[PDB]
């Protein structure tokens, strides 16, 4: 914890942190990602030059068509998985309540607006009041169970239900309001404090299935939100971290998380002010 | 100006807003409103105890049910006019936008948020991304336009097109989103901005019909909106303002506005505030 607060000094002082970011960039390979080009799935991707790798996409199981935008980013060291997708689509938040079944997973991490900067970057996949929202095309309905809002993010208690089996399960939807794309949260303090809540939960515990992350493209927010969370836990167990190395073993898993200099120098921050706590 | 200065400070120091909001029930009149209790109405009304009145209320033309939960508000002396309306049913955005397209409205006015103290008190009844929204009871469908969200308000454009004419208009959602039911805004400096947004597009002027103002039962934010915006204009034309009986006056057009003594007292801050801001 001191070392890389001595480090982001250095790194400030010496304005470095583009030059780090791109010395990044270099460095982190390129992997297959030819299924997420074949012609039957364009309609099922949100942006052209983000595709999830052919050995780390979540396969929709059992479907004619298994394919979804979405990446099981795995650290073994940390006991932390989590898959980080795109802001689904229209057609495609079937197939994202899909994964969110098969995968068992127990939280859904939103770290954008519906809207950002006069476009659509995700689909209201959620219901906002007490109508039930359907989605025919996979047999799965959501209910709202709970809303509490708060100035900078909001968490909904969500009913999931497997229509054709009937069976039911309560998704928490921690929902960031205040995080622009391409851009870094207002205060450490309070990104480390949504990072807690979804903690506090358990939906990032091993007993459940990984949590889903997204924002847009499942990138930027979305890397940073997981990178700092999996250094926090790789602090916690001891280990000796280079920030850097944790990102590229996490760019194996989907391409160019962590989208800014800026949010990487917002990454380190955060991971030296939730150490001391 | 000055005046309702003095009084502000003698009602606050003495704190007697209670006394005088109690005053107030006493002196607003009740008047019929049975259609608002027809058996084929009740579905209609979000709120049992909450009805407009039948000599105010907002008729849906060309329509074999007329009826709507909103009340036609006038203030002749402001030449000022609102629609207040429950926040809609599920059942009844269809004909909320309906009206909305009959009475050339320009503006809707939204003061609640979706979801309060975990219980729903308004439909969704624009749609939140660019998948288009149909209410074909009544033949309309809404589309986003655009958005822009402050810290204290959010405005959409909307497109409201009539799918049998083909026609479309666009209309201004203003969504105050920081204000609580039965509760004040959380500065008044913050509200006088937003109704200063309203006034700025024009949606509350003359050359366009009344502008819907809405919360969960349309009676308590929905009445401190109106009376601020109605004050402020009646300031600013030089009348002598008693605060007190521009209310009762609103009162005969739809029950009981403003709900609360605090929501009183707002009404004078933002109303004193709003003229020192505009002098």
Same mark, same amino acid.
């Given at each position: 914890?001191?070392? !890389? ?97 098969? =995968? ?19 689909? =209201? ?115 000796? !971290? ?36």
């Amino acid at each position: 914890p001191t070392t !890389i607060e001595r480090e982001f000094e250095e790194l400030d002082t010496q304005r470095r942190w583009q030059p780090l970011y791109l010395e990044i960039r270099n460095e982190s390979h390129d992997y297959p990602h030819r299924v997420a080009k074949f012609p039957e799935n364009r309609n099922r991707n949100r942006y052209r030059d983000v595709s999830p790798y052919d050995h780390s996409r979540v396969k929709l199981q059992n479907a004619e068509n298994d394919y979804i935008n979405a990446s099981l980013v795995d650290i073994e060291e940390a006991q932390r998985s989590y898959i980080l997708t795109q802001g689904p689509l229209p057609n495609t938040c079937c197939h994202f309540w899909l994964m969110v079944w098969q =995968q068992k997973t127990k939280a859904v991490v939103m770290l954008n607006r519906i809207v950002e900067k006069e476009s659509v970057k995700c689909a =209201q996949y959620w219901p906002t009041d007490d109508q039930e929202m359907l989605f025919k095309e996979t047999g799965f309905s959501v209910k709202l169970l709970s809303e509490d809002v708060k100035s900078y993010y909001t968490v909904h208690l969500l009913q999931l239900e497997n229509i054709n089996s009937g069976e039911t399960r309560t998704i928490s939807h921690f929902h960031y309001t205040t995080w622009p794309d391409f851009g870094v949260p207002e205060s450490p303090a309070s990104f480390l404090n949504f990072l807690f809540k979804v903690r506090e939960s358990g939906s990032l515990n091993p007993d459940h299935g990984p949590a889903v992350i997204h924002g847009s493209a499942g990138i930027g927010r979305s890397g940073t939100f997981s990178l700092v969370d999996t250094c926090l836990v790789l602090m916690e167990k001891g280990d000796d !971290i280079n920030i850097k190395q944790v990102l590229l073993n996490m760019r194996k898993y989907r391409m160019g998380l962590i989208q800014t200099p800026d949010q990487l120098r917002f990454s380190y921050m955060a991971i030296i002010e939730g150490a001391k706590c």
